[PDB]
Amino acid sequence: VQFKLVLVGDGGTGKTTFVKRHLTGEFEKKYVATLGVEVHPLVFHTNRGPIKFNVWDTAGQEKFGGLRDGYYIQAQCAIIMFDVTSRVTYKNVPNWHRDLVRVCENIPIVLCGNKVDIKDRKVKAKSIVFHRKKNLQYYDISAKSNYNFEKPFLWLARKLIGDPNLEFVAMPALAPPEVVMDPALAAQYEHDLEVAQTTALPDEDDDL
Amino acid sequence: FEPVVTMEEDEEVLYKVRAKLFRFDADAKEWKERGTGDCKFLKNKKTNKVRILMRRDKTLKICANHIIAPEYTLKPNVGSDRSWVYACTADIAEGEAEAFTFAIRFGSKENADKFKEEFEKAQEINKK
Amino acid sequence: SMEGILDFSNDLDIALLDQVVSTFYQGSGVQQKQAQEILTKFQDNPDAWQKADQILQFSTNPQSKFIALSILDKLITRKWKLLPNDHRIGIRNFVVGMIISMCQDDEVFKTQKNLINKSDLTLVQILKQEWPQNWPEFIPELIGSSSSSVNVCENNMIVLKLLSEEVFDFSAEQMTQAKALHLKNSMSKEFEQIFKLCFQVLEQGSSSSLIVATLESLLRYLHWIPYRYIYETNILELLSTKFMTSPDTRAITLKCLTEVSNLKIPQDNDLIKRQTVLFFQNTLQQIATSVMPVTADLKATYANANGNDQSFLQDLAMFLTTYLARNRALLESDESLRELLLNAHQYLIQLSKIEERELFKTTLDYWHNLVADLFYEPLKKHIYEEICSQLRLVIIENMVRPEEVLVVENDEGEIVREFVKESDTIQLYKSEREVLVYLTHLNVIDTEEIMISKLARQIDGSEWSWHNINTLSWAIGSISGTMSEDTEKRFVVTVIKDLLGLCEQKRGKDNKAVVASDIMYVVGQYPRFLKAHWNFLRTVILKLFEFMHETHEGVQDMACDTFIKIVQKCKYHFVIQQPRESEPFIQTIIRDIQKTTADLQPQQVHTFYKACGIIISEERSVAERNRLLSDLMQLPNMAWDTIVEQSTANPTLLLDSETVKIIANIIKTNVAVCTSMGADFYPQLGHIYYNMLQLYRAVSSMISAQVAAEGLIATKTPKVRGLRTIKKEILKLVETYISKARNLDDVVKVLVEPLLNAVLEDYMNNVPDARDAEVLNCMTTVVEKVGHMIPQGVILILQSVFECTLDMINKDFTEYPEHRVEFYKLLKVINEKSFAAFLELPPAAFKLFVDAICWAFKHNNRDVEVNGLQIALDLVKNIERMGNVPFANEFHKNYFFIFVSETFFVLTDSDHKSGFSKQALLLMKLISLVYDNKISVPLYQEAEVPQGTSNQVYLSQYLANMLSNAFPHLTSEQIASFLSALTKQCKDLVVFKGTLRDFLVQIKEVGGDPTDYLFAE
């Protein structure tokens, strides 16, 4: 039970950062432009059982475009990403959508305005109307603050499973191994622990 | 007159606190967030064994699942007065038992100190 | 082994290709990643297109053929004119032939839609290159071949749709002005024949899928075709009746009718008015009979989400809102049209109950449009009385949580503090407020009656819930200012009375927290009432003080914000002595400030002091204000005085992390009160200023000492972050004060010298990772307000910050982002207000300055880029103002071409799209300097060109050469023509920009037409 999901949008909009957040929980601060596409399995647990998205996270930058519209072939859903602190990224949403629906007629699509966490927003809420005539779901999101971060996937799952009351649910949690001891020595542990202590945790000003 | 036609039920909650969990990536020499949500100390009513179970907010995906082993030691992180670091040899959150160096930061220093107190109590319970 | 296809010295193994392609799309893991890299390298091989015909004939994988066509697409769009004419005919023929071939096999046509759509688009790319000048008969032959096969007819509608899109909808970015006009005019000239085929198919058409394709093509034509094709054929009848009954055509027809609606027809013509009414009447008739009646529960229907129902309801809302926004007046006068008007609005009412945020916003925009019109337009609101009354209910019951309400219910059913702000919710609240405010004005009796009787049903418990008391409370608060003061009086009294009763009658913490938040919101929203009722105002403040002791953190926080909010509006009533009161209330507040704030978090305490500052500033007697200010600051001033004794007895007491916190909070407290009091804060700043700058020095020392003893890692420790917080808050306080100061003489003679001495050298002489970017921010404000009065000061600031900061930010674009931003804001203000400081720079440092400006251009960071281009524009104006003198002559000789070429570089590299306007402006200014002989000396060396040669001629020559080497695939004429146009247009910015946009298109392909640059002329 898996669905091909294409993620498109201008470079630097936060596509890869968003996916990573979903994969590992991590927040990647550095900008390493995606080369072509990266495919990632991504599973969610729902009251209608597990759903798997094969996420085709594509390149936004023309020079790293690679296959371009070829990546969309047989996609069953998509996310279009822009950045609310960069007007040009919204101005380009129609171009991404054009290329996407020429290959993928009739699929559920979410439009996402990333980086709402940043104070000086440039693409005002009132401005964001492109999705209406194109029947796209829209969400304000922030990969950084995790604001509405689940919403794109919950909505897509609802559309693809065809159940409007689908919820994410708590995955079962097996009793973990009581046999903690593996190597008697644990020499390797001591080197890692000292390094880990003396490397500062990021974002020590955040509320958590 | 005929009418209308997780595995945590068997565990007790000793302690719950909001927190952010990191794991150390030795290759990158950087801390990476693994999850944000409720960190719970769960005492199995059948074994009396106490575990950490932590779920991400909204997705509810497990980002920590491991026994509060007697051998573990909470250590300070150079950057924080509200975090603990420790080595864990068997976390099954992402499936197959794996070793991680974890860090866990709290909203306040009191929370961090409370966590440490509870953590050491749970270690005691786990010894018997 | 997959890498075989990359080797072009051999024939392409097609079977191997298909394996690689299959592995990418259908495979996984490492094999998928390897296959992806290989296909990418294959595709980008500039000879790969030669293998295209091979892959189309011999492949058994549709994705292989897709990728072949992508290879062809990239050839056609970028290098088409470079091919000899044989290859152009050849490629055309096998694209056209493959399309015909795929449409004739019924099974392939059915199952290979992706591949055929890609083929059609590829054909359209060829049309853009050769139609119609080298393909006059494309359109007639397309129309002819349409009767030959139903599959070919259908596919032709796809081709025409794609063509209309490419010419009319997406041409602006992707073609020159001239080419876009050529192709629009060409489509326009042959549209008559296109339309007849399209109308034939619609009248007599059998195949449902052909009808759909034809309607899809029509949707695109409605963006541009003349009105006559719509209103002088029978086509409106067809859309609004026939094509609305069948559900497979309904969707596209409704979107088509929406586009027609959106046109503004000539008002004078009665016949067009009749038709605009009729298609609407027909459409609503087909909806009532074939889809759902007006009473249908669209909220339930949307929630069920059967088939396409959600999409259809969306499209219906778009149709009704679009049409009624531009044409409802046609329905408002004629009695026979009143049912139709009200039914359309009744549908909208039903649509507005759908639980779906973004749809709600679409309907809410329409309601705003209507209620705003009914507010001004005479004799209209009576028509919509029953609609508006229903709407009042919908909105009062769907009010979203305002910013100010900080309690919310979680997934365990507890009322708690809000984790974060909601900006999506914020705009929605404002939109709801606007409509509901208008609705209230349109019938204030109805609004009051709905709200009051809803309140009655909260009391008696019939409708009691958290949701129900909340939405109601928020709506009641939202309409503040709509009523008379007397109605407001009675209304607010009733509301408060009943909310207090709710509170008594409910038990438990959660309940008390809900009703507390609701009362707090309401009273905060009615300052006018509070102003006129001192006894009540006093009570709520005293009650807010009580809430500052609440253990429920949500309520605590909200009391603090409500206090500030009431104070922002009612401050005058706190500063004077009210009747029956012994003293002004500010006096009462200040006396208990210790007990009042004792359970608050530091930042809440600061808010409290800020609020008190708002009040104190209301007192215009200098003696009394300064005294109140003295009184307010008594706790922090006592703590401060005892800290400064201990601290200056020995610099070791400051190590204590508890002491660092105390100091930080003292300064923060000062910042809070300065923020609200501005210029009135000066005496308090004077009390602490000299000792504070000594503390800044002492704290600096400890930071440097720590970094020496522990390493760069020390900057991450709690102790050092706390010490740095002290420096940041000190800088913030000085910035805040100087930003609002009225007496600038004191700033210059008292504040500036000690400040510069305390901060500049400390910044300069710290390691990069220990420099506070807040220093730069402070200096920016200093230069902003008093720069003109401290010329030697500004020089000192540059010396101390300019080169060391530049070296931090000039290795990459990523590191020290805060310094980066503040740095360019500093240079901007210095260049505006104190340009002399840049003249006094040694030549080497002036060169670094220019390097710094151009460096800013190349940022993607909008904060840096925007300031970069501004500095450059302002520098040029600064130089031009100096007139004909040696510094200006040397500047032009040294830097004019650097600025021109650097501006061109960022214009043309496709990585700085965001700064296009300002880039263009800078470039225009530079070129105009030469065309107005505002440069007094030659920009070329004597040996280099013939003596007496004008700068105009030399600039042409320089630029031609630059572009020739930078873009070698352009012809000489392309470059000559562009520069000729560009230089001519250097006073008309919008034309100039058009010429640049034309250039950015042409550099992306070969053989661009040089005559395109005559498009304005």
Ligand SMILES: Nc1nc2c(ncn2[C@@H]2O[C@H](COP(=O)(O)OP(=O)(O)OP(=O)(O)O)[C@@H](O)[C@H]2O)c(=O)[nH]1
């Ligand atoms: N403040 C903020 N920054 C973000 C957010 N999401 C991503 N970023 C940052 O913005 C940059 C975006 O990086 P990516 O996710 O690599 O961008 P991309 O869209 O994948 O870019 P391409 O791969 O070139 O298409 C990174 O530096 C992220 O740390 C967000 O929600 N808020």
Ligand SMILES: *[C@@]1(C)C(=O)N(Nc2ccc(C(F)(F)F)c(Cl)n2)C(=O)[C@@H]1C
């Ligand atoms: C409960 C909400 C309530 O009514 N309380 N008393 C009270 C008295 C006066 C005021 C006011 F309006 F500010 F003057 C308020 Cl908000 N509440 C409570 O104390 C309960 C929280």
Ligand SMILES: [Cl-]
């Ligand atoms: Cl906004």
Ligand SMILES: [Mg+2]
């Ligand atoms: Mg990416």
